[PDB]
């Protein structure tokens, strides 16, 4: 049942030193699969995760011939046989380096970045989800809580504007100010979830959706996305 | 059946002159309860209404002690049955004291305000709800309409622009330029409602939903709350 | 079963050369009937049907005593049957007089636009609808499919920003970089689709719709157009 | 030396039961002249004047043959002499229903600001589609969005947090007044800046 | 006198059919020259003008050793010896496309207003990155949006609702203008800009 | 010719350990002064300067008895003379929760930039709600949405792709820098403009 299918991938050269994140190609398509790599504990990031994870994505960025990113998470739990996408960062804080750096790059790279939610996505976790261009998620297993335990002001998680620009002000609103646990069907119903599918079937699903995006015009898709973060047409 | 529960409200010194708003804490939470007290008359407000409406948020917004405000309407009407939050102003005004200082208060204060809509909120009524941070409503008796008849200019009823931010711009030209009426679960589908709640547990999940609220940071809450009125998360 | 209930409309005076277009008034309604009528290639524009197009909506902008455009497409095709409200301009152009014209032309004229969606909505027919102010959508028939072949320019489908404002950044991404075909319920699910009708009522439901706004003050009905459009009520 | 020109303008039929505000239409051209008219408390707003300021402007919104609306304050004071557009507040309209009007209304509005403009009276002038100042006389002062889509978020910080007072050439520099005018010349001005309107239109 | 050094630049392969706009390669620098090439009738775009303009900065866009894009007017008019960048409009693409590829495209495009600027000609120069203009000849002239969002809402009013014509200097000190330079000189201040772009790269 | 005033200043209990970041208390004003320490590294921060610095803006916002926070860089630099704001970067929190903290506090948070305010240093000055600079040795270079917002697009647009130097007056022309004041008055200045703040307060 699990959504890695292993023999469809290829390991990115150049990379050999990873140990928090995994980097593949496809065996055909023009896509990169990039995963948290730390099951163990839920997936979530550290600082050397947050750098590697940076490093993945900028190459990603820079690769002529990858079209589109499918980020997601490793698993499940050998521990409990949970799923994880990214329980976000150190949960006691307060008692590249920063995801802030990473979201960044998510949000202006010029290529089509999904998320796939294969577990819980929590914290900096679901912010990462919140960042990127579309989601998917597994209906059995996807979480959705919006926490700022793992950040270091005082003044709020991160990426509030771009929720409230797919959900509402109101949804919005909920999601930050109580932080409950969502299903991917209800974050679907609000509309940060572009879609719902079976868990075993998340990544076959990702492929088939990142191979319509790669089938368009490259030129057409960068400067949508332009145009989608600038919040105009440009016409 | 009635949503208020009596026993667990305290009145809030220094408002003894009250006559068209109650007002009262929580027995235990940081949680105020600000109400119209006009059934028999829908709870339609006129210029003394507003007057006490404003004075009363405003004292809820500098009471340091004070987290959430849940703002409804008390009922029912004794003459029909009828339940209303809020019907608005003057409905034939054309043939704080004005409803837009009040709206400007709720929007900008540094708490949340949580809209408990037991009836009908209708006009000023339906603005009133729109501004609020959340919006829970009484699945049986919750009725939504945007009219203008109680605003003195010639230009259309207020706070078109937060309502297209929660709901979208096709819904809430919809919900402006044809005026229609809808429930509590049609507003919860187009995102100008967070939640359905059975009609006697309004405010018992008001309440709930104020403690999870209060139980988080609240240097957070209005540092968020602040991002979310900017349209931008600072970062 | 067809929509259009001929009866009930009278040619506008002045519009004898239209090949392209049908433009009626309805014989007691303040409302107009503004089709593409080449039914036999699926209502596809030419730059002749463009011209005809803004000369016919501009006449309604124009006109004292019309409140109300309906936008449709005329049909069924005599050749399968099928129903196609616009499937765009000229598929194959890259190997007022422009359709950009006209969706700035129906986006700030101060009189509200219905588009019925009879059928396949596609390319530059897909951007007709969302620059709309409503859409209401054949059950049966409709079809959604945001499509750039009829684009001249290599960087995208135009009105990206007005779907985002309506469905929301995720769902307005997707719609662009995959560019599926959905059907009226799923377009209503998104925000994009104000309701869904039962064919062959289509335009009686549009005739309902336009009565209701005309029913309302045309100065409020127009200064909230002008405030949508701005995304500030200028309170 | 006062910028009103009596031979100029011309009452509007129906509003001769006007107690705050003026409202002229000028002799030849398409252009309204729309007036605070409390000089005695340096013009400014009661609910009634707020509600008498909304039909006026709304009948100058609805009148075909209308281009310009001039919008600005009579003097000077008959109490200290002073000069003032208007300052600020002193029912059933909101002052932000008339804003909305001034911003929305398919007429061009300038401001011709006379004398002081402060508080309402200066959000009332921000507001107007075009400003022109009385170089002697003008007074700004904010006793924040729109302003800072005119002078930028800085100084229109400044104007809020400080709360200074500031000249028609400081105002125009910044960019929130298009240009300035001689007092005695200001509403000559501006019927030509209206002028050249109506001629483009 | 004329702005354009010959020497300085060299045709770009594969576009020897161009009619209405011309398209050289520095012969050094990773800057192109874009410019309209109707002086006769004031560098005014037709249909056909619009989609070679768009095929030539669509080339421009791909070209990886080109930073960045000087767009501007040949002349002066062998009509009348005016001198214009563009005049606006006199057909596969529409020219909020162009606009649209050059606010989007990721290299710079200076607009060098050598002249008259107006109508379509004024909203290209404003959505450039950035404007030299000539301080003899430059002329801007609307016959709203992107305009505000450089010289503030008062003056992006004052120029579409007046259509007054405006110097070199005067959109300078609004805003709309980056710098001023000598007619003759500038091409070559827009090379030494596009230079420490490059430089910068 | 320091801008420090040794004998106004009061330094705040419990910060003795500060060790990248200096922060007092005015002698009598609601007002405190918040200062990058490593003048002998031109102000750059490193992730501890990003952490105290945090620290010490959050303990400002939750002052009831402040108004004003004064934003400034120590000075001259031990190393070379020179004078520097911030020169950017040389670990819990981003340099962006900074910037947050910055324009979403209830106080005023007035830059004195002091001498080169470059890359983060730049972007920090820009997010202050007020900016004051030294005449003589201010500089500003940025090695964009909200520049925009101060300057316009043209202006932010030359700031970011040329990445030139700008004095306290060029940045004060265009809008982004409030008042110049000279360097051995710039804190005298500061704490005059927070005066009027508090006083309005």
Same mark, same amino acid.
């Given at each position: 049942d699990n959504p890695?299918?292993?023999k469809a991938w290829r390991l990115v050269d150049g990379?050999?030193?990873?140990?928090?994140?995994?980097?593949?190609?496809?065996?055909?398509?023009?896509?990169?699969?990039?995963?948290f790599n730390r099951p163990e504990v839920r997936n979530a990031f550290r600082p050397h995760t947050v750098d590697e994870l940076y490093r993945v994505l900028d190459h990603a960025r820079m690769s002529p011939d990858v079209g589109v990113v499918l980020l997601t998470g490793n698993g499940p739990?050998?521990?409990? $046989?949970?799923?994880?996408?990214?329980? $976000? $960062?150190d949960q006691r804080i307060r008692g590249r380096l920063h995801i802030l750096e990473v979201q960044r790059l998510i949000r202006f790279m010029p290529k089509v970045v999904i998320c796939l939610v294969n577990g819980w996505a929590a914290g900096g976790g679901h912010s990462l989800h919140v960042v990127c261009d579309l989601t998917l998620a597994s209906r059995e297993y996807a979480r959705?809580?919006?926490?700022?335990?793992?950040? $270091?002001?005082f003044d709020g998680g991160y990426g509030s504007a771009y929720l409230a620009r797919q959900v509402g002000q109101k949804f919005a609103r909920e999601i930050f100010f109580l932080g409950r646990t969502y299903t991917a069907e209800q974050m679907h119903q609000m509309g940060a979830v572009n879609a719902v599918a079976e868990h075993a079937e998340l990544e076959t699903?990702?492929?088939q959706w990142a191979a319509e995006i790669n089938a368009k015009s490259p030129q057409a898709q960068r400067m949508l996305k332009f145009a989608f973060n600038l919040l105009d047409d440009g016409l």
């Open positions: 890695f299918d292993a990379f050999d030193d990873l140990t928090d994140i995994t980097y593949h190609r496809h065996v055909d398509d023009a896509t990169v699969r990039v995963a739990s050998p521990k409990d $046989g949970g799923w994880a996408f990214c329980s $976000g $960062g959705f809580k919006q926490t700022d335990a793992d950040v $270091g002001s699903v990702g492929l």
